[PDB]
């Protein structure tokens, strides 16, 4: 009949609802236990930690009611899943009634004389052997006349104190003592039926039926369970609805229990399911996306108090999101995108945490689009730069990083301070070794390779900052020519001609190796084509006009070079000038 109770339960939590009544610590401890049980994937330890979670639930109950009932269902389920009759008798102490039996027996132990409510307490008592030990020393003496009874009772207790393969031997010895006692008022019948209860016969256990669960316990597999319930509900004891809930917990229908717990306020339902998916086996779809939507929509509004460690937020939501089935990414995409729709905010903590979460699984593309669109967020007008440039650097897209670099050095050529003063805070990566060593700790193959693209503008701005005696000036010039040469190799890049022109004016206008490299650069620039020369010259024409802002003589010489009446001359000055520098420097024999 358990299937009928299951079907009735299915129509029970259908009229119920869902409500996140719980406080933050319950949720935190819950998802902590869950993540501790999921990241571990020798399962007894998980059961122990689960029991610890249960202890935390009981603690939350004492400190303080759907929480109560659903906690009872959780405890019961986890105890069934786990000596099944031993743990059943262990849960017998804590009742699911109107009163109690334990406190009744404890207050029944001492007595001046034998009470009339004694034998029924014997029926209830059947810690069992210890309870029979008090029956061994009952005292008797109630009007009475011996002719014995003491020997028979002592025998029954001696047999009862045998155990608490061997159980069959115990039963055989029991039957033997039954024959022995039958071969030899109220006492006789009482001892008889008590003995029948100790036996395990159905005619004795079904007799003492104060409660349905009480008779259920009094009776190593789930089939034995189903048999126990098939013989419990057949009698007239139980009540119809919570009771159906436990009736399903006991039954093989675990799913309906999860549904009922979902009908309860607690999100612990999910947790139960999370334990039901690691041990047990087998409106919208199943009960994996339901808990998903429930939890995700629950934490969507709740921030919670600050824990020992940070929990920005949106951490538990994703941690349970990708804790399902392998269709988790289908929901991760949706929720992360929903976060992207509201990502438009100058806050690095949210994106950092979100990245920390998305990088905890096999989902790199989502974090990629996240940091990329965050770089798109920090496009703005002209601030943050290197922060933004770093949020371009991370998660691939190196062409975009080179684009930001190009825009930056272009802005340097137009004015060459460029990134100065407060903008240093946007970079602040003054060290080229320490910074990369402290940044590649997260992602080596990303931060190191993308960080190796920063040397150019760094040493260039260094050269701009420089302009110890006269020789470090030549060292700075050598570094500058080296950098220009580095950004001159990418041609066989449009802002190159202006740079090479400034350095051109700086060198000579009436080492050694650098001269040859510059000459090779001019050679590799004077034979490009019509594509990458018109843009370079156009850029050079847009450089001489200083709108957003040594170099003065350069700008004056160039302004007098392109003056007309109404670019190649610069290179001619390069040829003449470097030919002079070779007429002088190259003749340095010793």
């Amino acid at each position: 009949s358990e299937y009928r109770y299951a079907a009735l339960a299915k129509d029970a939590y259908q009229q119920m609802g869902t409500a996140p009544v719980t406080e933050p610590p319950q949720v935190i401890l819950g998802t902590e236990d869950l993540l501790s049980r999921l990241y571990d994937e020798k399962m007894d330890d998980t059961l122990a930690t689960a029991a610890a979670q249960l202890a935390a639930l009981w603690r939350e109950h004492v400190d303080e009611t759907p929480f109560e009932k659903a906690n009872y269902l959780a405890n019961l389920a986890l105890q069934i899943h786990h000596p099944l009759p031993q743990t059943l008798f262990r849960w017998l102490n804590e009742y699911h009634m109107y009163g109690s039996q334990v406190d009744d027996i404890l207050r029944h132990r001492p007595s001046p004389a034998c009470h009339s409510l004694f034998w029924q307490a014997v029926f209830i008592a059947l810690k069992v052997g210890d309870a029979a030990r008090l029956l061994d020393q009952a005292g008797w003496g109630h009007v009475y006349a011996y002719v014995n009874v003491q020997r028979a009772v002592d025998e029954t207790i001696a047999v009862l104190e045998s155990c608490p393969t061997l159980f069959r031997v115990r039963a055989r010895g029991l039957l033997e003592h039954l024959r022995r006692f039958a071969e030899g008022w109220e006492i006789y019948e009482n001892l008889n039926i008590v003995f029948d209860i100790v036996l395990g016969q159905q005619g004795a256990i079904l007799e003492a039926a104060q409660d349905w669960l009480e008779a259920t316990v009094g009776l190593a597999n789930s089939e034995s369970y189903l048999d126990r319930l098939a013989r419990a509900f057949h009698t007239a004891v139980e009540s119809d609805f919570v009771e159906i809930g436990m009736a399903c917990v006991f039954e093989d229908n675990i799913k309906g229990v999860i549904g009922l717990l979902r009908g309860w306020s607690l999100p612990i339902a999910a947790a139960v399911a999370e334990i039901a998916s690691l041990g047990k086996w087998l409106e919208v779809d199943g009960i994996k996306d339901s808990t998903l939507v429930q939890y995700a929509q629950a934490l969507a509004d709740y921030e919670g108090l600050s824990s020992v460690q940070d929990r920005d937020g949106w951490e538990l939501s994703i941690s349970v999101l990708g804790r399902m089935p392998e269709r988790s990414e289908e929901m991760v995409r949706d929720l992360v995108e929903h976060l992207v729709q509201q990502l438009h905010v100058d806050s690095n903590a949210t994106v950092d945490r979100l990245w920390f979460l998305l990088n905890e699984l096999g989902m790199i593309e989502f974090a990629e689009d996240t940091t990329e669109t965050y770089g798109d967020i920090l496009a703005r007008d002209s601030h943050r730069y290197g922060e933004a440039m770093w949020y371009y650097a991370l998660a691939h897209r190196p062409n975009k990083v080179r684009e930001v670099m190009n825009l930056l050095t272009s802005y340097s050529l137009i004015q060459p301070p460029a990134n100065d003063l407060d903008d240093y805070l946007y970079k602040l990566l003054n060290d080229r070794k320490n910074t990369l060593e402290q940044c590649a700790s997260q992602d080596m193959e990303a931060a190191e390779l993308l960080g190796k693209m920063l040397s150019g503008y760094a040493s260039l701005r260094q050269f701009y900052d420089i302009r110890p005696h006269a020789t470090p000036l030549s060292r700075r010039k050598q570094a500058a020519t080296a950098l220009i040469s580095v950004i001159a190799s990418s041609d066989d890049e449009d802002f190159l001609l202006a740079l090479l022109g400034e350095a051109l004016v700086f060198v000579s206008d009436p080492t050694l190796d650098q001269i040859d490299v510059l000459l090779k650069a001019i050679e590799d620039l004077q034979a490009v084509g019509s594509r990458v020369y018109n843009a370079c010259d156009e850029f050079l024409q847009l450089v001489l006009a200083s709108a957003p802002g040594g170099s003065s003589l350069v700008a004056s010489q160039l302004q007098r070079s392109l003056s007309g009446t109404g670019g190649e001359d610069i290179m001619r000055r390069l040829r003449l000038g470097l030919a002079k520098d070779l007429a002088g420097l190259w003749l340095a024999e010793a």
Binding site: A527, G529, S530, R531
Partner: protein, 713 residues
């Protein structure tokens, strides 16, 4: 990997390659020997079509890019130099056709923007002539050869993206290009390419490729028409071929469809493509290296070439006539065809009798009787009557009665006494010997045989004797079978009207013999055309490419002169080739007695060759002996007046030294953008500064300034 065009040079020795990645590669082809040499670069978009120049104007290339710019390349002293750039097209320039050397040095450009500009080559630098084209764009252009013979030293058709073509003609009245006659709606879809036939004939053939249909307009002195063959991928590029008037069509089918012309009127068939048939009789494909040799398929010509050479050596003696028994010799075809016109006059049943006398000898073997019938199929009936005298009893009495006027032998003998029964090469002769005699007719036997084979299967396949004996009755043309006996058949009996088609067949056989690694017989057969201008031009250009591959000794030149070719075109063409190859190269044309103005313009080559005095003195003596025609002899004698001042050394002016100074100055002023010439005259000027005063003839800034600053000190 994405090549859009590959153009062979005038000789077929240097391959020009364009590409899509802005790279113009230059290869050196010597058969299978692929030698990469030089690479050029400097365009915005993809390069569409390159085009070689005529060697008379030097090695010049014409490149058209996707950007719309047109780069004209040219090599200078063994090195390539980018000279001129013409950019006047809003869209990409698809194709650029090269002008013929008889019409100067022009250059037609075709772009899909709405105009087609022709680029004239001024002595110094470019002159441009702008015309207007189709509104929907233009993707094709091709030059038309005029009527003039000239080697050393005008219309053009424009294709359309507006589903039409046009024909431009030169017009000096307005110094532009007038449209005399417009063609109408050749296709339905945009025309992909148009190509003009380089072959000189009575008519001009135009190829038009688009809707997967192809038009071939035959432009006689009237309105041309075509027969569009529904061949159905799209056809993009079509290249003509001066190797039998061949027409190569190329579209997207991983193959090139070659088209030849039949006398009936139909043409028999033998991402980008861009093929170009080399004038050295070779087809170039675009895999990327293509070199497919295309020629007519027939029985080996070495024997026929021997007979042909035997004909030339026995006819060409003075300054012609095609005979029969004078060049018959060994081949049975000539001897048979000669007496075939006469109705069995020269013993027709005797020659075939000898033929089966040499054929039936293999049929009488292993034949145990049956050999009687097998010999009866043969001409002689003596051995047949003998074998039928051996056995068969009285059957002989019938057989001998047939040579005077329940069994297969009896049936065959009876049938032959009055079907063929079996098949052989002697079948027609057998039918000829036993269907005639009653009237002694030959035409009746041939006609009856023709009807019989018209009602039979597998009869007389692929034979020369077929056309030979079929030519008797209904004297016309049938199929291909040497062209000497054809002209011989044209002289006496017969194929009326199609004389110009005989011209085209002789041109086809001329180019066929020209593609068989031969020039001299090709030169002879090309000299045997109907028109004068056609023969002259064809022989001229052919001798160009022939002498390109021809020395003074007899073994070659006397073989080229025995044909009757004048000593003017040969040497002129040879030197035309030698131009692209030296200063002593023009000496050939100098003593060729065919130089005239070329000898006067040879000083341009004598210039950079002074780098050495006695030689120049001798050449200048040769130019001194020839005081003929601009003919600026006073300014040309400067080269002779230079070693005079060089050997003079300071005792007084020559009273002609000022004349060579004035000539050197006039030359230095007239000499345009030629750095070699300017440097030469500058050097030879500095040479006579240390000798005499040398007040004029100062050129360069540095040498003049510093040397004058040192001499005045």
């Amino acid at each position: 990997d994405m090549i859009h065009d590959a153009v062979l040079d005038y000789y077929g020795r240097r391959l020009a390659t364009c590409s899509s990645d802005r790279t113009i590669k230059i290869f050196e082809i010597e058969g299978e020997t692929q030698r990469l040499t030089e690479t050029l670069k400097g365009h915005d978009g993809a390069v569409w079509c390159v085009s070689w120049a005529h060697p008379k104007y030097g090695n010049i290339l014409a490149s058209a890019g996707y950007d719309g710019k047109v780069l004209i390349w040219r090599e200078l002293n063994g090195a390539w130099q980018r000279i001129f750039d013409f950019a006047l097209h809003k869209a990409s320039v698809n194709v650029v056709s090269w002008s013929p050397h008889e019409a100067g040095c022009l250059l037609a450009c075709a772009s899909s923007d709405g105009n087609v500009s022709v680029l004239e080559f001024r002595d110094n630098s470019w002159e441009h002539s702008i015309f207007h084209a189709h509104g929907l764009g233009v993707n094709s252009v091709s030059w038309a050869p005029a009527t003039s013979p000239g080697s050393i030293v005008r219309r053009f058709v424009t294709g359309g993206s507006d589903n039409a073509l046009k024909i431009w003609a030169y017009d000096p009245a307005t110094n532009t290009y007038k449209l005399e006659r417009e063609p109408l709606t050749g296709h339905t879809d945009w025309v992909r390419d148009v190509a003009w036939s380089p072959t000189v004939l009575q008519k001009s053939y135009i190829a038009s490729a688009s809707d997967r249909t192809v038009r071939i307009w035959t432009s006689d002195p009237a309105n041309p028409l075509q027969w569009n063959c529904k061949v159905l991928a799209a056809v993009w590029r079509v290249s003509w071929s001066l190797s039998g008037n061949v027409l190569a069509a190329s579209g997207g089918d991983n193959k090139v469809t070659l088209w030849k012309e039949n006398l009936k009127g139909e043409w028999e068939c033998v991402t980008n493509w861009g093929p170009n048939g080399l004038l050295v009789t070779t087809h170039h494909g675009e895999p990327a290296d293509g070199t497919l040799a295309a020629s007519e398929e027939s029985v080996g010509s070495p024997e026929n070439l021997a007979r042909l050479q035997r004909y030339i050596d026995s006819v060409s003696f003075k300054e012609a006539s095609p005979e029969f028994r004078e060049l018959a010799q060994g081949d049975p075809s000539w001897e048979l065809a000669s007496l075939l016109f006469d109705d069995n006059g020269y013993g027709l049943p005797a020659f075939w009798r000898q033929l089966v006398s040499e054929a039936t000898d293999r049929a009488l073997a292993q034949e145990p009787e049956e050999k009687a019938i097998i010999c009866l199929a043969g001409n002689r009936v003596a051995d047949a009557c003998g074998y039928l005298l051996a056995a068969g009893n009285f059957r002989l009495a019938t057989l001998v009665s047939g040579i005077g006027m329940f069994s297969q032998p009896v049936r065959a003998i009876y049938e032959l006494l009055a079907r063929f029964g079996l098949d052989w090469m002697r079948s027609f002769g057998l039918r000829l010997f036993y269907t005639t005699g009653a009237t002694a007719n030959v035409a009746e036997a041939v006609r009856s045989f023709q009807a019989d084979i018209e009602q039979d299967k597998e009869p007389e396949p692929d034979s020369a004797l077929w056309s030979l004996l079929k030519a008797f009755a209904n004297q016309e043309f049938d199929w291909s079978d040497g062209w000497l006996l054809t002209k011989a058949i044209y002289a006496t009996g017969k194929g009326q009207d199609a004389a110009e088609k005989l011209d085209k067949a002789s041109l086809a056989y001329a180019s066929a013999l020209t593609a068989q690694s031969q020039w001299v017989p090709a030169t002879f057969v090309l000299l045997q055309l109907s028109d004068a201008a056609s023969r002259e031009a064809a022989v001229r250009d052919h001798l160009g490419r022939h002498a390109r591959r021809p020395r003074n000794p007899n073994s070659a030149f006397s073989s080229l002169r025995k044909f009757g070719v004048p000593e003017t075109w040969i040497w002129e063409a040879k030197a035309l080739d030698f131009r692209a190859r030296s200063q002593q190269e023009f000496l050939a044309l100098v003593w060729a007695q065919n130089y005239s103005e070329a000898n006067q313009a040879f000083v341009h080559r004598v210039g950079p060759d002074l780098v050495d005095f006695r030689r120049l003195f001798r050449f200048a003596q040769l130019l001194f002996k020839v005081k003929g025609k601009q003919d600026w002899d006073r300014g040309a004698a400067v080269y002779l007046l230079y070693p005079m001042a060089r050997l003079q050394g300071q005792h007084g002016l020559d009273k002609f030294d000022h004349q060579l100074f004035d000539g050197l100055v006039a030359l230095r002023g007239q000499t345009h953008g030629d750095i070699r010439q300017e440097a030469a005259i500058a050097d030879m000027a500095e040479d006579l500064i240390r000798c005499r005063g040398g007040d004029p003839r100062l050129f360069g800034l540095l040498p003049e300034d510093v040397r004058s600053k040192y001499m005045r000190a």
